[model samples]
Target: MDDVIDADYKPADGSGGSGGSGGSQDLYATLDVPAPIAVVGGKVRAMTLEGPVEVAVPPRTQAGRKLRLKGKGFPGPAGRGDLYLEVRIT
Candidate 1:
């Protein structure tokens, strides 16, 4: 995908789901400039609700995969911005 500007995310409730919170990830944060860009080669993208994505640590040499935040913030290596996590009703 070249560009996916102005991404919208509504509740699944309208689509399918309940208001009750049994257990599920909440919308943490959405950091963006709001303006469109011609090229965003190395972007931070969007982040999920942080807390503990996984429970208990596996071996040092574990396979599989998860989230990656190495290439974040602006160019070079500074002024990085990370979305925080919080559970609250909208």
Candidate 2:
């Protein structure tokens, strides 16, 4: 399995999809994310606003299951946001 990174952070009311604020991203499936399959129970190092953070993959996880790390997103008026990673198990 290959390492994947989906670091596209957005605003609280940001929208995702074709021609939208968040872009054409459908987290329901990895069919849109152009990356290889992610390994279950694998740990990924993500660079966030607070620096590098480790994100672990749960065992037997399915696609569309999002793993979030608080305060790992971009900085805004409301303070640092969180990071949401949509996992896809193949």
Candidate 3:
């Protein structure tokens, strides 16, 4: 798990990071999965001129599935920058 990852970034949500989405990532998103099976590039952008930088992840096949998204990258007003994943187990 620590081999492929280079950034080793952590979310400021006080979760201390995790390998599963049980920490902070909500169910059904893949940006911050605890143990990311794969990595996806993304960016959130603002529409208006001089708008805020919208850094976000792009659409993923794991969209509807249950996964875990962990915190990564830098954090800002849009809540601490974290990953996304579907973390559901019913």
Candidate 4:
């Protein structure tokens, strides 16, 4: 299995900056889920910059499905951003 996961972190408003202007940019991370687990749905751990976060994969989850983790993204002036986990069925 490929352990390298792709991540895309950018500003939500498409502005180019470090995000300190009271704007929260959502984080994007890829989750390689096994076929069995993707079908039945279960808890899966995703490695993030902070640490590993366990999230529930809904039943019959399809590829490219995005799961949102509230207030789990990078912090900004406004508040903590959300983390989006994109499912990649393997």
Candidate 5:
């Protein structure tokens, strides 16, 4: 047997789940926000795995940039994932 084992291990934050336990699955979505809106740093509301949330934008930002919102992706016993906002300037 070449398997690792631990008896005094616990999940981070003292919570339990399987979002980060082990897997190759991921969630993704694309948002089309007006260039003007992103340039001025506006807030956009959208639905996420956790729930509906408002994404904050930075003024004068360029496209191809991503904004990371912590604990706003998917809610689970382990912990919530992250929300990534990819800026698409047009």
Candidate 6:
């Protein structure tokens, strides 16, 4: 005669715990340009993902232009994402 018995068990806490290992999402913001000089050749204070930062607008920058800030987004697993600031001339 032959007999067999089996039992299964699991952790009391839980299985497959949450692991935050994903990169952050990109950020998009609008930069208000008051004067042409600021857009043409001047530094403007733009609100970014982190906070207000001084950004140098490109020469002859047109309205609805976007400026890229490398590694200025939220923190992530590998690195920070990029922040895009859209220029809006008012």
Name the top lDDT candidate.
4
What does candidate 3's lDDT look like per residue over 1-90, in tens digits? 532222222222333322442333322222332223323433322221112333333334233343222344223334434443332211
After superposing candidate 2 on the true structure, give the runs of residues whose Cα lies further than 4 Å from its correct spot.
Answer: 1-40, 45-54, 75-79
* Candidate 6 regions with alpha-carbon error over 4 angstroms: 1-23, 76-78
**Please, what is the TM-score per model?**
0.19, 0.37, 0.18, 0.61, 0.56, 0.58
Candidate 1 per-residue lDDT over residues 1-90, each given as its tens digit: 422222222222222222223243223342332122212212223333322222111122112222223222122323322223221111
In order, candidate lDDTs are: 0.25, 0.42, 0.30, 0.64, 0.51, 0.53
Tens digit of per-residue lDDT, candidate 4, span 24-83: 457677887888988898767677655665667777777877777665476565556678
TM-score of 5: 0.56
Which run of 10 residues does model 6 get worst, by summed lDDT?
Answer: 1-10
Question: Given candidate 1, what's the lDDT at residue 53?
Answer: 27
Q: Give the per-residue lDDT of model 2 (tens digit) for 1-90.
A: 224433333233333222223322232222222223243354545443334445555544556666544443444443344456666444
Residue pairs in collision within model 5: none
**Count of backbone collisions within predicted model 1:** 0
User: With candidate 5 superimposed using the best TM-score fit, by how many Å does residue 70's alpha carbon deviate from the native?
Assistant: 1.4
Using TM-score, rank the candidates from best to worst: 4, 6, 5, 2, 1, 3
Clashes of each: 0, 1, 29, 0, 0, 0
**Cα-based lDDT at residue 68, candidate 4:** 70
Residue-level lDDT for 7 in candidate 5:
9
User: Superposing all C-alpha atoms, what RMSD in Å does each candidate have to the true structure?
Assistant: 17.6, 11.1, 12.0, 10.2, 12.2, 21.8
Off by over 4 Å in 5: 1-26, 77-79
TM-score for model 1?
Answer: 0.19
